[PDB]
Curated annotation (Swiss-Prot), chain B:
Reported function: ATP-dependent transporter that catalyzes the transport of a broad-spectrum of porphyrins from the cytoplasm to the extracellular space through the plasma membrane or into the vesicle lumen. May also function as an ATP-dependent importer of porphyrins from the cytoplasm into the mitochondria, in turn may participate in the de novo heme biosynthesis regulation and in the coordination of heme and iron homeostasis during phenylhydrazine stress. May also play a key role in the early steps of melanogenesis producing PMEL amyloid fibrils.
Regulation affecting activity: ATPase activity is inhibited by MgATP with an IC(50) of 1.03 mM and up-regulated by coporphyrin III> hemin > protoporphyrin IX. ATPase activity for hemin is up-regulated by glutathione. The ATPase activity is impaired by increasing copper concentrations (0-300 uM). The ATPase activity is stimulated in presence of glutathione for increasing copper concentrations (0-300 uM).
Description of its domains: Contains two independently folding units, the N-terminal transmembrane domain (residues 1-205) and the ABC-core domain (206-842) are respectively responsible for the lysosomal targeting and the ATPase activity.
Listed name of the protein: ATP-binding cassette sub-family B member 6
UniProt gene name: ABCB6
UniProt tissue specificity: Widely expressed. High expression is detected in the retinal epithelium. Expressed in mature erythrocytes.
Spans through the membrane: 7-27, 35-55, 119-139, 141-161, 243-263, 273-293
Associated clinical condition: Microphthalmia/Coloboma 7: A disorder of eye formation, ranging from small size of a single eye to complete bilateral absence of ocular tissues. Ocular abnormalities like opacities of the cornea and lens, scaring of the retina and choroid, and other abnormalities may also be present. Ocular colobomas are a set of malformations resulting from abnormal morphogenesis of the optic cup and stalk, and the fusion of the fetal fissure (optic fissure). Dyschromatosis universalis hereditaria 3: An autosomal dominant pigmentary genodermatosis characterized by a mixture of hyperpigmented and hypopigmented macules distributed randomly over the body, that appear in infancy or early childhood. The trunk and extremities are the dominant sites of abnormal pigmentation. Facial lesions can be seen in 50% of affected individuals, but involvement of palms and soles is unusual. Abnormalities of hair and nails have also been reported.
Known outcome of mutating residue 264 to S: May be a modifier of disease severity in porphyria patients; loss of expression
Membrane topology of this protein: Multi-pass membrane protein
An annotated GO BP: intracellular iron ion homeostasis
Consequence when changing residue 241 to Q: Does not affect N-glycosylation. Does not affect N-glycosylation. Does not affect trafficking from endoplasmic reticulum
Residues in compartment: Lumenal: 28-34, 140, 264-272
Part of the whole protein covered: 258 to 828 of 842
UniProt keyword terms in alphabetical order: ATP-binding, Cell membrane, Disease variant, Disulfide bond, Dyskeratosis congenita, Endoplasmic reticulum, Endosome, Glycoprotein, Golgi apparatus, Lysosome, Membrane, Microphthalmia, Mitochondrion, Mitochondrion outer membrane, Nucleotide-binding, Secreted, Translocase, Transmembrane, Transmembrane helix, Transport
Lineage: Eukaryota, Metazoa, Chordata, Craniata, Vertebrata
Naturally occurring in which organism (per UniProt): Homo sapiens (Human)
Length: 575, 571
């Protein structure tokens, strides 16, 4: 009974009560069947016979069969049951997805997505299967066991309660032990299956060397051997399944035989009448064709057990590198940035962070162009709250970044990337993606402010186009102009920027760095680059060898100094 | 094999016995109730009841928790599908290595074997379908109609005639409705995970935008649309099962009321209602699985047509005009005047010109790049020549069979890949005809024995992805071991000599002298020893010969050749 919405409470309650009705008509259908046989044994009036027989046939319509042609009640149960499985499935999928995008960058670098999204989806499938399995299979079939014991031990002869109770115990125990034994065979068949498939696929994939040494004949022979070995073990596993099913049938056979003969004895001794015998025979088979399906669901709870703990592990792994639990906002006015004893160990990088101390001028442009290596992108990520400070003081406008909180940061800050990574979507969403809660007419206004109008008329249908892998393919300058529309919509306090090594054409280049100067106006920027035009518009440059600051000044100061920037400028002057 | 003829004969007979059980178990049930309603002599009653319960054990309910004969047919039928699965799998794999590289290098091996196992599973599922569900359930329908028709009054044959024909007809029309919902479904599943995985990939730009609220709201919107489609899915399936259920109910109701009327009128006996009331459920419950197999038939037949597509086709790059044997005896190497057409590249053959008699080791050199193995792929009959003649030992390669040239040539690539196995089958892999004494004798004779015995397991070491991981020089020496135990008539070589260890490079060159002990080789390399080893050296620029002459002649010519050699050697 989830407390989400009152409609869902009523669907849950009506489906539970409807389950109760099905487990109630489980006993009525045999009881009616016995009454019909008694009406036919000694003669009955047709007028009452017809109504009782029709009443029975509609009750057997309500439950056509056990797990096959389940019947009106079970079918109506399953159709209304999905409308709470949608709720719980949707809720857990949203929660796990929010947690996946909660986790930090360092989690997301190496491990992929489809190897994790499968874990999420199969975990949701596992929990839905667990609740549906349990509530509709464990408690109902155990309830049927209690009703069989109770009803045959009260209203029919007590030793048939004995035969049924013993037969249920013999069946359930035998089923679970041979399911374990079959389980060890399942794993044994699976491990060889991996080997036969692996040898096959690599023997094919090495076609160059198979061709190189005439290896088709021996390759056929060894693949046939792997097939024969897999066959000779699959025979063993399927013989185990055969023995399991056959002894399930043999225990049902002994249980039915004991009851049928004992009932025959009591009916011939006339303590019971023929209807009671027909009831016993039809009630056992009804009681068991669910139950062989119970064993199947107990061997498909094994996969669920592995998925659920894995789902719980992913759900409970949160980096939580730094945050202020009091939700303390940011008080930002100009862009005063502080460097003092800023040291941090960096993983998987040639450069590291080694005691940098050079505050940037607020309102000005202090670029960082220098050596090969992604330490510039590293300090960009570090300033953009992606890695923990080990030792250092970072004070945007005079307050520590560890306690001013991330929502206030990303409201107060806006940073563009170097590779515009875009979806298979429209363009209107990707230009309003800077501020999704901003109106359309102003996002066309900011798009024309970026200059995106030219691609709009280049589109087959303009601002309502489809762009991506499932849409049209734009160019890099177009997409970076979408990105600058994103950031001017996002209204930054401080802009940080990077580019790749690609410039499309001079006509778009002059426009895009004109707009870069426009957005860097009234803003401090610490830009990183490898493009001469995006370096010369910035005045003062910081160059860092291996995490520590080494040169200083402006670009002509570096040229007269003769540093690595001067060598790069000579190399770009004459290639 | 004739034993499998015995297994299939006993399997068809076992199906026949299983059809007999289906009519007999209810006829026995009617007899037990008959003997029960009038007063029963026990000593016939007890034996008839246990005879029935024996027979009901053999049948094992309807289907699901299947009976003795069904499990026996399923068990002993494995021995036949194993045969046809193994045979058609070997047919695929033989004709798929025998298929040319041209389609094969354009395909990835993960999906081709996926299609192969899917096609084989399709063939066995389809044949088990067609002889174990189609003919059986149709046979059971006929026996039900005939039994209730001729052995009873005609109207019950009427009822079950109409009920099976109607049940199957309704199951058809509703299963194509369900199928059109299923395809609209599964394309919307394709959307609903594509946008999920793209969001997870674009996480970084999301984090710069702080757009996680927007992306979870877009996700939950399109998953709500998914939920609506799921609801329509299950409502369709519920209508299918419930309409079936209504047909079951209509047949049972019509029969039960009609039977009750006849047994009140005593044209039918009191057992006969129990006969019909159990028998029509016994017919009905397998037919619930028949819609499952009319839904299997679609996937089955599209994959098995895919199997005939990929199998009965050919690529067959090397045509067999005369398919003759080569008159090779000493090994003249002859490239002359071939204009071979080539696309998606610049490596057409614009009449390269070099030939060597036996007694002349041959070289090749040109620009940078790994495309020089195209010449060797042309050399070992992977692509036929358009216009011109290529000879080996004076014999043109355009008319002989492929296997006549396949054996005689020893080529070592840059990396002969070592399998996930021992080294016994690795030295067996060079050539299989020889014995253990001479393959480990050539293992000592090729200088791999030192590190084989230096490794802590010796000749039986487990090596590869399923074993230990070796080194590049050792596996190159393994390739040299394979070709020196192969003992091919003439050797066309490629050589790594990747300057890792100088001692192993000297072992490589000693192996080179031993494998070229008065026999010719052609070498594609850019290192000093492996270029001065050959008698003459030709420069080829994508099929264009530009300079020929020895190492000192080319270095005295001194152009792009000498500057790339000296810039590679030093800086
Ligand atoms: C009635 C029924 C449901 C619905 C009830 C419920 O869901 O609660 C169900 C669910 C599922 N069945 C599933 C998968 C499979 N079940 C198979 C095989 C079988 N199904 C059977 C019965 C059922 N199974 C049985 C007695 C067999 C053996 C005979 C045969 O082989 O027909 C096969 C092999 C097919 C082949 O070998 O041809 C597969 C791949 C999946 C996973 C997702 C998917 O793959 O759809 C799920 C949730
Ligand atoms: C939350 C869920 C698990 C509740 C499920 C409850 C049902 C499994 C039980 C509860 C009470 C049971 C009923 C209690 C008493 C009877 C009367 C009983 O008939 C008689 O008393 C005599 C019949 C005869 O003469 O043979 C038939 C079964 C029935 C309807 C039972 C059917 C099964 C019921 C509904
Ligand atoms: C919703 C669709 C699937 C139609 C379902 C129809 C049933 C609900 C109807 C059709 C046949 C009807 C039966 C036809 C005949 C009789 C006998 C009748 O008894 C008599 O009057 C005897 C003489 C005679 O019927 O001519 C009592 C009602 C009953 C059981 C009827 C009960 C209601 C039934 C089952
Ligand atoms: C090829 C595959 C599909 C198997 C087909 C089997 C049928 C051709 C046969 C084999 C044994 C037959 C059964 C053998 C004996 C009987 C008893 C017979 O009982 C009688 O009352 C008839 C004789 C009499 O009048 O005394 C009714 C038919 C039945 C069940 C037969 C039904 C048809 C069966 C199943
Ligand atoms: C497959 C393995 C696990 C053994 C299964 C046991 C059956 C083969 C046995 C157990 C119950 C036995 C039955 C128990 C009672 C009787 C009644 C008996 O009738 C009599 O004449 C003796 C009793 C009397 O006097 O009424 C004839 C043998 C029979 C059918 C037996 C036949 C053989 C049965 C079915
Ligand atoms: C959609 C599927 C379920 C087919 C439905 C067919 C029924 C609507 C038909 C087929 C058989 C018909 C019956 C065939 C025979 C009889 C017996 C007949 O009366 C006699 O012949 C009595 C003879 C005697 O006194 O022994 C009256 C009509 C009736 C009930 C028919 C009523 C209409 C029935 C049930």
């Amino acid at each position: 009974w989830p407390r989400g919405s009152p409609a869902l409470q009523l669907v849950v309650l009506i489906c539970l009560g409807l389950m109760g009705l099905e487990r109630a008509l489980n006993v009525l259908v045999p009881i009616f069947y016995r009454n019909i046989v008694n009406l036919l044994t000694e003669k009955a009036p047709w007028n009452s016979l017809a109504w009782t027989v029709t009443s029975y046939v509609f009750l057997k319509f309500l439950q056509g069969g056990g797990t096959g042609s389940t019947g009106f009640v079970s079918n109506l149960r399953t159709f209304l049951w999905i409308r709470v499985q949608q709720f719980t499935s949707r809720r857990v999928e949203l929660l796990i997805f929010s947690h996946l995008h909660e986790l930090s960058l360092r989690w997301h670098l190496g491990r992929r997505t489809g190897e994790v999204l499968r874990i999420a989806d199969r975990g949701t499938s596992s929990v839905t299967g667990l609740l549906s399995y349990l509530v509709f299979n464990v408690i109902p079939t155990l309830a049927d066991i209690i009703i069989g014991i109770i009803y045959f031990s009260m209203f029919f002869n007590a030793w048939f309660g004995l035969i049924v109770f013993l037969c249920m115990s013999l069946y359930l125990t035998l089923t679970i032990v041979v399911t374990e034994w079959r389980t060890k065979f399942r794993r044994a068949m699976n491990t060889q299956e991996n080997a036969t498939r692996a040898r096959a696929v690599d023997s094919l994939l090495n076609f160059e060397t198979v061709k190189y040494y005439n290896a088709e004949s021996y390759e056929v022979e060894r693949y046939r051997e792997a097939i024969i070995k897999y066959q000779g073990l699959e025979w063993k596993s399927s013989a185990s399944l055969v023995l399991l099913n056959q002894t399930q049938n043999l225990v049902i056979g002994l249980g039915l035989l004991a009851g049928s003969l004992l009932c025959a004895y009591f009916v011939t001794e006339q303590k019971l009448q023929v209807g009671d015998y027909v009831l016993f025979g039809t009630y056992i088979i009804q009681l068991y064709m669910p139950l062989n399906w119970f064993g199947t669901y107990y061997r498909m709870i094994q996969t669920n057990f592995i998925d659920m703990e894995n789902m719980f592990d992913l759900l409970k792994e949160e980096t939580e590198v730094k945050d202020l639990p009091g939700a303390g906002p940011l008080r930002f006015q100009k862009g005063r940035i502080e460097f003092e004893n800023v040291h941090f160990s960096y993983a998987d990088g040639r450069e590291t962070l080694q005691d940098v101390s050079f505050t940037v001028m607020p309102g000005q442009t202090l670029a960082l162009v220098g050596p090969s290596g992604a330490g510039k992108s590293t300090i960009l990520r570090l300033l953009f709250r992606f890695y923990d400070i080990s030792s250092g003081c970072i004070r945007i406008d005079g307050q520590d970044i560890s306690q001013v909180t991330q929502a206030s940061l990303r409201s107060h800050i806006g940073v563009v990337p170097q590779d515009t990574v875009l979806f298979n979507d429209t363009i209107a969403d990707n230009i309003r993606y800077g501020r999704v809660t901003a109106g359309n007419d102003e996002v066309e206004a900011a798009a024309q402010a970026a200059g995106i109008h030219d691609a709009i008329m280049a589109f087959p249908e303009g601002y309502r186009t489809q762009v991506g892998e499932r849409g049209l393919k734009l160019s890099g300058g177009e997409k970076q102009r979408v990105a600058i529309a994103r950031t001017i919509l996002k209204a930054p306090g401080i802009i940080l920027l990077d580019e790749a090594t690609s410039a499309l054409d001079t006509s778009n280049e002059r426009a895009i760095q004109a707009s870069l100067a426009k957005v860097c106006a009234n803003r401090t920027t610490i830009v990183v680059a490898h493009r001469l035009s995006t370096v010369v518009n910035a005045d003062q440059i910081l160059v860092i060898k291996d995490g520590c600051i080494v040169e200083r000044g402006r670009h002509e100061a570096l040229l007269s100094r003769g540093g690595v920037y001067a060598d790069m400028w000579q190399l770009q002057q004459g290639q």
